[model samples]
Target: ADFIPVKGKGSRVWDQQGKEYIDFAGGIAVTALGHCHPALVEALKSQGETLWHTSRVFTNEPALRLGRKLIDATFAERVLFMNSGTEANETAFKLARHYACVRHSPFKTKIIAFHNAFHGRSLFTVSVGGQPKYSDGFGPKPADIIHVPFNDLHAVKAVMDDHTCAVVVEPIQGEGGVQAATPEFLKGLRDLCDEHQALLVFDEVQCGMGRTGDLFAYMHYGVTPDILTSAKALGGGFPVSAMLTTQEIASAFHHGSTYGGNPLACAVAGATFDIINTPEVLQGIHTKRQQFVQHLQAIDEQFDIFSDIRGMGLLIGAELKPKYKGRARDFLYAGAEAGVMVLNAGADVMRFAPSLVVEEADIHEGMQRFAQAVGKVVA
Candidate 1:
């Protein structure tokens, strides 16, 4: 059912008809601090009273301040703001390809990404993403972009060459079933980029900003990306995204966003970063991950339905057993009917990426509701 939400507080949202549900979907990992987080609301409110937008022709204080904070939090020396993940990634690919031609080698124009990966919905980004469902049927898609297997170092090694301009990946594959990259896989990518002198890009749109118990998932693996795209949770619930890179790479560009780094988005995003980049919130993510695993394990032990339960931090997924294959959506709909909101990460997995700050009681209660949802499937 298309439930139009009227209000949300913390980990719960109420529909237009006054029905309440626990939000385990996290707005597809966008509500980093849950709905209407006090800090985020205050930031938006304060900035709304002040200037909201001034084109990049004249930068504003909020944008500048947000850029500085992002730099301080990650390996980026320079940051460019955008309104969504699609824009951030589209810009990153252009920068990478352009930088390769301008500084590295004119022939270095190919970009390598992974299969089942999702960058965004724009023409350039959709083409860069390995998923053909989004990229195809649009007539001629962009060229020189290659696809490889995620977490397979040898596959990446085979595709990447001296002519490759860049390799972009999610440290943890979000849309591809919450798969985390092995440490060896991450380290090998960094090494391969160095060997080829190509930029390594991390599309952290769904996994960054403390979703995986760190400011960025790359931090957990000690891997660095030359160009990193962040969004989803960057502005708490606001629509904002950013592409970060070294000052050297950033200088390859000559364009800017008209509404990207506006004061309102910047203020809200800065507050989100400030809140999520802390030891407390980061640690809370780890604790929540453990709690989630425990509850999911409990359900699995009783039901024999989960083939595997795995993920880092709150981006959890349970692959259904062979007997329950292709029934993930049925389970998700059941949860919705039972007053809990969960996500179907494709037909093979039931995904749960709730708020990092969701109350422990809610986690347990939601899981209890999910077990009922699961029982419906088993019946």
Candidate 2:
């Protein structure tokens, strides 16, 4: 695979020619602390000097501390660290199925996922993910996995039964056009899982780690899951991820990763967590969100480019109006040309998941560039 060049730092990146661009995408929401924050830099330096890695055969101090921090911040009693979101999710799915096999029955291996959801690229994960295009041409897909329309409790109820082992959902569907699940819908899933003895799994790889203005998006909706996955901003640009669960559910994993708990990644993530899991940082998220919404609304008012704006915290999405429909890619390309970087969820929705600590000036400038792009395409 070819690497895309990102020339430089802080909350803004550049290309080879040194064209400065506002980074509203946060490297797809991975750089929550922005590029090379001082705390992270220090953490990396300290950890790098002491030790770089120790495979899972031997545990490391930084990994243990990071685990404890995650446990303290959320409902998880135990945490398994990994190198990326996909690995965390892969661990979650495998643990879920294995738990079902032992605690319940072999037939209780079926997994239920939501439509338009994007989990990861692993064979099993892609099979369980909601989008058929991701699974297409991958022969002999995982068995007994089902997909249902998101936010539809009735649809979930129709498919969930005694044999269903788990239901995987994103608290806010990031790749699914930034659709937030209703409180009622989340509650329904909780109730159903309780009744059917199935585990509730929240894929917070995109919406978690303070992107939703909470340590975890499940907390935002007041619903708790038996298992949760987090990545993206977990290490704030350092590659790290976690699969969290209660003690009982976590016991199913007899597996571990060699590089999963590298001391360097853990130290960086712990520092990132310290900043993100605080009231001041979390509260500032809403203020920034309002600022973005107000500015985008003004642009929409002027040009009618967006049909709708939705999402919570920094994981936002704007849908293109009728005249600008099916032109999301054009907007993104135009954004790149205008010295701004953004992302898209599908054919019609532009997605934005900026750093939680992004500057107001950058937000304003990024939106202006986005507005210019929209105007160019529509005109």
User: Using TM-score as the measure, which candidate wins?
Assistant: 1
Candidate 1 lDDT, 145-258, residue by residue in tens: 989888889999998889999999999888898888999999999999999999999999999988889888998999989999999999888998999998788888753322
Give candidate 1 regions above 4 Å deviation: 255-260
Off by over 4 Å in 2: 1-4, 255-260
Whole-model Cα lDDT of every candidate shown, in order = 0.88, 0.89
Clashes of 2: 0
Per-candidate RMSD vs. true structure? 1.8, 2.1
Which lDDT tens digits does candidate 2 get at residues 146-220?
Answer: 998999999999999999999999999998888999999999999999999999999999999999899999998
Lowest summed lDDT across 10 adjacent residues in model 1 is found at 251-260
Give the Å shift of residue 211 in candidate 2: 0.1
